Structure 1
Amino acid sequence: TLTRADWEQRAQNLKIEGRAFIQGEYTAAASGETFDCISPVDGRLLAKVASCDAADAQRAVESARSAFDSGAWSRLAPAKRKATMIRFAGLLEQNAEELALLETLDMGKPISDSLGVDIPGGARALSWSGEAIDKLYDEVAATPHDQLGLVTREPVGVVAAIVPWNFPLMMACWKLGPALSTGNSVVLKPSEKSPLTAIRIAQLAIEAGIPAGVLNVLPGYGHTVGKALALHMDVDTVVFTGSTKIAKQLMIYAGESNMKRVWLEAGGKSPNIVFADAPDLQAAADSAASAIAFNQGEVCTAGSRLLVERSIKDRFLPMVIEALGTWKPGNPLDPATNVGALVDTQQMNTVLSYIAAGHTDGARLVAGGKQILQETGGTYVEPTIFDGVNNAMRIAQEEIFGPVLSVLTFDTAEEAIQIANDTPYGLAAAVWTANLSKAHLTARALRAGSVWVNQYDGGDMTAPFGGFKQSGNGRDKSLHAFDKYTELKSTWIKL
């Protein structure tokens, strides 16, 4: 097991690829322009990364289209596509230490989380999806004797995947697994705040046996190459994970261009509801702190609204404060660190401004509240809790995307539900109770794509993930994710 000194040495000894990847080769952007990739660990320069624009989008899509039409991947036998996807996952695992390190340096998450959660999470999405390919069956309708009615699925063609910076590799693999498994060509567009792991795995895909042109990667800004992909007249489908504001813009771009399918995973303000009869309050307290502090609270399913039944509030909140105290910001390259840096200065100032807004709107600070470790040249903030929060407060309505907890109380189940659903969002929610009826009925009443009962952040590759309402449309993970990347065809044959 590697030490802090080992990781620091490894970080120094990396050679970091920064180019885009098109038709099987790394390449500069057509303009030759780059942007600086800066580490939030200490501010070091990782790489000059290709800054792609519309011209590069055009070339990547021409490459994607041509590869799709050749059938090299899109008409490869299901069992061979499975084998290739599983080897692709295997190469992520074989290169886990470098990939984990890139992620940590790129966007600041703890090396033990990169290594233990992100890389295996990414590989598992690729291999599970690959495993599923020949387990899927299409349909034959019940028809008259002189008819054969087939209902089958086909790949849409060229897929644009636009992804965010909080789980760069894993979110990429959530798209890539099903999109590639179904036979599509994909143009992947990583966040400008974390381009490095996407750039790196382009090569691994080739090594696994993914044909040239099937997976192209275009680093660069959202408002340049990202927008260009979303407006492209020969992209069939765009899948997106990011902010709600940009998600809406993609719908507009699709309407302005070619009516491409649009699938969105956006923000969240997930309610974590703890009833007095929770089976294990200590477990509920640990999970409540984890739900907001893990990955610096840069998690769209962060349990950012803690709803607690009033009769246990006085006992429970100290338990949460105590639990939160074990999550301490520190050097991300130290294996012992469990909370890392925020992704950048812009992100940190947003979080600090929301903390200020907590004070302004009348909430009570009971833990954290300040920036720390300024001397490192990195960006760190204490996990923070506000008590006495009303659901109309800004820190209650708006996604903060930092480790900032809002605590709300209720006295009836019906009120807990009303408060929990009082949001434009609907990504996730949790319910803690030992009562059979109350568990299922409350879960059923919550308008969220994921509802966790007596746990937080549950589910694995078998569990569809995505939003109600303005948290998005469609689902990642499970077999349901495949439907985003395919079209139904009814073939009706007269005999």
Structure 2
Amino acid sequence: FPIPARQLFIDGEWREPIKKNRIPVINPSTEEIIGDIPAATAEDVEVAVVAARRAFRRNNWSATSGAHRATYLRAIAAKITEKKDHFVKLETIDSGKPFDEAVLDIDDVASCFEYFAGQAEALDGKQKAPVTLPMERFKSHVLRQPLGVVGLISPWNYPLLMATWKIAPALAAGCTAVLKPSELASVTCLEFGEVCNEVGLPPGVLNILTGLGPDAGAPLVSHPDVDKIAFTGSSATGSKVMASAAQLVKPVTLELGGKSPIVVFEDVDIDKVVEWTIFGCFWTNGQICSATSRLLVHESIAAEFVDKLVKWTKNIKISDPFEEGCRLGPVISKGQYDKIMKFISTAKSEGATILYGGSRPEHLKKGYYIEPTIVTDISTSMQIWKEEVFGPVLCVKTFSSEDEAIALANDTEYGLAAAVFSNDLERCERITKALEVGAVWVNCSQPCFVQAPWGGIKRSGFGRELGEWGIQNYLNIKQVTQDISDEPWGWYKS
């Protein structure tokens, strides 16, 4: 199909980068440039935040009720469901993710807006919520207002979904925003610009700057009229954006991925659990923030599990994303390809065993394809064990004791997610409690519902997006307390 030429979406209309630079979009499956995106620069950020600030000042969006903004949200969700086919295809060719996965993404963005429409609606009538004071002299309630203009910065692994994880709560709260999506996957996001016009979003309420991290994002976060930054990306980058935000004591939420464990005890149906473990580390082509990329399996089932494991993954149709039956596409880019490949090299070099994969597929001669990979004979000292690979690469180690599974699981600087498998539920509760982590899956891995709070701890960052926590990141919690006594304070003397 025809990717589209598209431009910068600023103040409801399409604008050209002030420096007129652009960058390639590239099919991960063909290595071929299949198109073009604007390359926003600091000067574009300036006009964008200005539009956003102006839009915020209008008595047209921000001081509006939640129920009012919920209709635009509900409408956006509807529009997306309508142009479904169109989005899911664009997302498959831009991301390199299996077409079947992309269908889920797009259903999920629709569903996300609809959940936050609800949130915005519940925002009303949280307003002026009373707080009880001791005195009778004073009365007090809470207002929940938009913080103002917010910068949203998202990753390429679920282009539109990750972006709406930010857009939906931001808009629900009454903020205006500047979105800067990954330079590795901007098309659906740019295409979102039209959707806004089609649903009648006031101009400047959502602005979309595509471009490189350093050129477009950095200026977004350091801008003096952006009140809050919502960042999702690597921990290394997180640190950078938080330091920049610190200059202006600007609030920040950081979702930074990790090195999440999946611990499997003896008492499990090793055929399903095996299916998850594959899901937890290979799906989305291994590019999952919460990827359960470290398997801690009991020595008991150790061999067998791993056997069925290699069998199942051996079972995965690695092909071009559009090809029917495709359960695994190419990684996002040449750079990522190289990085993942190097992680593999230095893992051999460090003395681990590539008990499957670790190489290009075979049937695929072009495109950034990499075979689901299982590596064993692991030391907790090796790089592969500590570093997030963000490719289809799984590490295996075994354990004797329960609290050795525990110690071994918590043995990272990261702390995003974890998955524990066992039919002994009193054992499951005990493990979920002990995991130094923000999300614990019990007898599954990766299911992420918009109803539930989502974020990490430790190097994985802080703050919770989604659920009933999402909208809160974009609000000014305002206390108002008034004197109803009409008597003098009586502290001083007249």
TM-score range, shorter chain: over 0.9
Shift of 1:378: 1.2
Question: Quick one: distance in 1 between partners of 2:192 and 2:82?
Answer: 12
Contact 1:307 1:410 (C-alpha < 8 Å) held by counterparts? yes
The one of 149, 168, 172 equivalent to 1:158 is 149
Query: CA contact under 8 A between 2:29 and 2:369: conserved in structure 1?
Result: no
User: Deviation of residue 328 (structure 1)?
Assistant: 2.5
| One of 353, 358, 362 as aligned partner of 1:369 | 358
| Distance verdict in 2 for CA 1:374–1:67, change over 3 Å | farther
Matched with 1:171 is 162
Secondary structure of the corresponding residue to residue 228 of structure 1: helix
Q: Counterpart of 1:61? A: 49
Name the CA distance, whole Å, in 2 between partners of 1:17 and 1:44.
16
Aligned residue among 92, 97, 114 for 2:85? 97
Corresponding residue to 1:260 among 242, 250, 268 = 250
Give 1:333-372 correspondences, 5 Å limit.
333-372=322-361
In structure 1, the residue matched to 2:274 is 285
Structure-2 separation of matches of 1:304 and 1:322: 18
- 1:71 Cα offset (Å): 2.7
| 1:484 counterpart (465, 468, 473) | 473
* Unaligned 5+ runs, structure 1: 1-10
Residue 60 of structure 2, aligned match among 72, 78, 85? 72
User: Is 2:136 the counterpart of 1:145?
Assistant: yes
Cα displacement (A) at 1:154: 1.1
Specify which of 306, 309, 314 is matched with residue 298 of structure 2: 309
What's the C-alpha RMSD, in Å, of the aligned pairs?
1.3
In 2 relative to 1, CA 43–436 (structure 1 residues): closer, same or farther, beyond 3 Å? closer
Following superposition, the deviation at residue 44 of structure 1 comes to 3.2
Q: For residue 268 of structure 1, give the secondary structure of its aligned residue in structure 2.
A: coil
Partner of residue 413, structure 1: 402
Alignment partner of 1:484: what SS? helix
1:245-275 per-position Cα deviation (integer Å, ceiling 9, x unaligned) = 000001110122x211111100210100000
Does 1:329 pair with 2:321? no
Contact 2:279 2:446 in 1 (8 A): no
Q: Tell me the distance in 2 between the aligned counterparts of 1:323 and 1:372.
A: 16
Residue identity in the other structure for 1:445:
A
Runs of 4+ in 1 over 4 A off after TM superposition: 373-376
Q: Supply the distance in 2 between the matched residues of 1:289 and 1:32 (Cα, whole angstroms).
A: 44
Deviation at 1:92, TM superposition (A): 1.0
- From 411, 426, 433, the equivalent of 1:422 is 411
Query: Which segment is superposed worse, 245-254 or 363-372?
Result: 363-372
Equivalent position of 2:228 in the other structure: 237
Deviations 1:40-72 (A, max 9, x none): 121333322111111000000000000001031
The 3 A distance-change label for structure 1 pair 364 and 43 is: closer
Deviations 1:108-166 (A, max 9, x none): 11122112x11011111111111222224253111233321012211110010011111
The aligned runs of 1:370-389 (5 Å cut-off) are: 370-372=359-361, 376-389=365-378
Shift of residue 459, structure 1, vs aligned partner: 4.0
How much has 1:210 moved relative to structure 2?
1.4
Verify the 8 A CA contact 1:384 1:404 in the aligned structure 2: yes
Does residue 1:269 correspond to 2:259, yes or no? yes
SS in 1 for 2:68: helix
- Confirm or deny: 8 A CA contact 1:108 1:340 kept in the other structure: yes
Q: Which residue of 2 aligns with 1:124?
A: 111
Distance 1:103 1:454 in 2: 30
Aligned partners of 2:238 and 2:256 also within 8 Å:
yes
Counterpart residue number, 1:216? 207
- CA–CA distance in 1 between the matches of 2:428 and 2:443? 9
- Letter of the 2:473 partner, please give it: K
C-alpha contact (below 8 Å) 2:3/2:90 kept by paired residues: no
1:39 matches 2:35 = no
Residue in 2 aligned with 1:393?
382
Amino acid at match of 2:384: I
In the TM superposition, residue 323 of structure 1 has moved relative to its aligned partner by 1.4
CA separation in 1, counterparts of 2:273 and 2:347? 24
CA distance in 1, matches of 2:213, 2:419: 33
SS in 2 for 1:150: strand
Aligned to 1:246: 237
Q: CA-to-partner distance for each residue in 1:74-115, whole Å, 9 max, x for gaps?
A: 122221211110110111111111111111111211122112
CA distance in 2, matches of 1:82, 1:142: 30
TM-score calculated relative to the size of structure 1: 0.95
Residue in 1 aligned with 2:492? none
> Given that residues 426 and 449 in structure 1 are in contact (C-alpha distance below 8 angstroms), is that contact kept between their aligned partners in structure 2?
yes
Structure 2's unaligned 5+ residue stretches are 485-494
Relative to structure 1, the CA distance from residue 17 to residue 73 in structure 2 (aligned partners, 3 Å threshold; closer, same or farther) is farther
Amino acid corresponding to residue 213 of structure 1 in structure 2: G
Number of aligned residues: 480
Amino acid at match of 1:271: P
TM-score (norm 2): 0.95
Moved more, 464-473 or 36-45: 36-45
In the TM superposition, what whole-angstrom CA distance separates every residue of 1:383-420 from its partner, at most 9, and x where no partner exists? Answer: 00001212221111000000000001111111111111
Aligned to 2:490: none
| Letter of the 2:479 counterpart | S
Matched with 2:38 is 50
Query: Which deviates further from its counterpart, 60-69 or 40-49?
Result: 40-49
Greater C-alpha radius of gyration = 2
Q: Give the deviation of 1:494 after TM superposition.
A: 0.8
1:441 equivalent among 406, 411, 430: 430
Determine helix, strand or coil for the equivalent of 1:180.
Answer: helix
Contact 1:391–1:408 (CA<8 Å) still a contact in 2? no
* Amino acid aligned to 1:24: G
